[PDB]
Design a protein around this ligand. Sequence first.
Ligand code: AMP
Length: 643
Amino acid sequence: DPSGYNPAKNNYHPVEDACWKPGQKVPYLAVARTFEKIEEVSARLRMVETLSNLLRSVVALSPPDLLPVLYLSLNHLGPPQQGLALGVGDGVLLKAVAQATGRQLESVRAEAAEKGDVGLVAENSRSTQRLMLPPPPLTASGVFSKFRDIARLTGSASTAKKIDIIKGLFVACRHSEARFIARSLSGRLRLGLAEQSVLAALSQAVSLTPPGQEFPPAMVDAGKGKTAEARKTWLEEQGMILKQTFCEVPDLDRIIPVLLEHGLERLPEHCKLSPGIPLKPMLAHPTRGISEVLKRFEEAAFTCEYKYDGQRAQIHALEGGEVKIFSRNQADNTGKYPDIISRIPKIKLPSVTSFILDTEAVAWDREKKQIQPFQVLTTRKRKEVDASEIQVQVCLYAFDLIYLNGESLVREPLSRRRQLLRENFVETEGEFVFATSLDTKDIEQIAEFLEQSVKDSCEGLMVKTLDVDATYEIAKRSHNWLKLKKDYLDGVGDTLDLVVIGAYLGRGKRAGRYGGFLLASYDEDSEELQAICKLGTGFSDEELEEHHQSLKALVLPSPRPYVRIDGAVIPDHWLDPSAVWEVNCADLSLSPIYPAARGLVDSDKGISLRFPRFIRVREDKQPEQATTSAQVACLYRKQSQIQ
DNA sequence: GCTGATGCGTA
DNA sequence: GTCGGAC
DNA sequence: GTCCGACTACGCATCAGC
Ligand SMILES: *P(=O)(O)OC[C@H]1O[C@@H](n2cnc3c(N)ncnc32)[C@H](O)[C@@H]1O
């Protein structure tokens, strides 16, 4: 009985402790009970083993259901390069809950905001749907198929057809299924277990219970013959095999069939990096100063590069001439850049047959020959576009080469990857140039280079080692680069003091308290408080709780007449304007919804804050002494990318 | 035909 | 994108 | 440091309502 399924017990037997016979469709309640055990605990090692116990039963009993269970665990619809999206958020989901329960739409919405979780609302609610015959139980493969049916619905009356499928899943839900069905559609499973733990559990499962055995499986625990140390070392080595293969081929549709046929030890023989298949990109960790760079990169030689304010473009050139461009989320952006594809012959030497370039697509003004801000880049059409209709030109800033002429450069150091990039590729001003770099260890040269990058319309500096731990192996370390921005440096930057005028009820980890706040600057001329941005990060859990304690005494039934928010989200609790906080941000943007400093730089648009975070409470200041809207306008114009 | 709410994907 | 929490 | 899930602004694409 899947209701009593306990994949977190001691001495879990993949065959006998399961809740379905061999060859049967894996019941979705087995996935739901697994999700229950995972969210109860907080140690990743316990979560991985609990999920591994489920996958071992799937491997031993119903191998065809391995893929949908893995996707349901990740809450994904398929490979990222296929661009499958549900099209369902909280708006559609809360409507499907109301129709399924006969409740008012706002009653469900208010309860969802109060409880901070939509899945809890769908669970305690009472179904108003009557069925002539009791529905069959949900299966993991059937539920996963319905999700892809919802994602496949487009056109007129799509919402009603999506809602019907969601309501069809709810009438067949048993026990905790409705809770996790709603969370999946809401996109907030709240497991504490994501892509890294799903892979860790997959490699542990296929290692302890090897696939491809005749039933019943002869080897059910391949680690019982090993010591605790030998078992740990072996499982860790098996985990790296899967992690590095998935880092180069993040496609479960390609790995899982190979895995069930040739095992994990022979997986690299059948799944290899190749152009046309997106790869996991290299990420960066923040650095709070030039001194910390030399500390993290002690002894090792590194290079400083401009950090361009654009969108990452992973450009693949296949053997044959086909070109594909992927985002850093492995989304296919080929149709977005007809101009880049036209430019490919201009960037490579005639000996270059195939490559994978790591570049930054930046909006480029061809009349003035200068970089344009990130907001200009986002105005480009996203769907299939034609090159003749392009209005915002892009310039590619290449900084790495991952693949060259049938050979992978993943395990080559950056010094060689960079050398191969600049030997085989041709620069063109305003179209394809190599990222501005500086090889140095001097603190004053790095400081001057950081100031020069901001003056040259860039966010700051990227710092990468050249020879020591300088490979492109994401499984070794996904954040092996360093980023140095001015807003990271203590004292070297501008911060704003804004008034808290509203609060937003928190979700998930913030459930039961405030998850966000609405901030405002003081407009001197109109003597009003103008909403500038929302704030929801920068404070500790202890600080957030004290914010929730004191601000509850400031809850107003209706807003004060001198508070202007315009198009901003109406706060859940209006707050009497009293608390003033210091806020840090990366940039100031021209906002389509916030009224702060409207008319001071633009007649229609106001100003907002890019990447805002809470620093400290300013008990010394009252709302009259907050940062003025005129000062907000001054800070916006002092930016290099702005007139 | 237009607009606004919703969803998604970039940072 | 930033951030803190649990490990 | 790793992994994870809270949270930010904003613009295109989509679709329901007018
Ligand atoms: P995130 O804040 O993790 O930073 C990494 C992204 O920065 C962009 N980027 C701009 N310029 C560079 C250079 N020179 N090297 C590497 N990355 C750069 C990329 O789009 C990254 O996604």
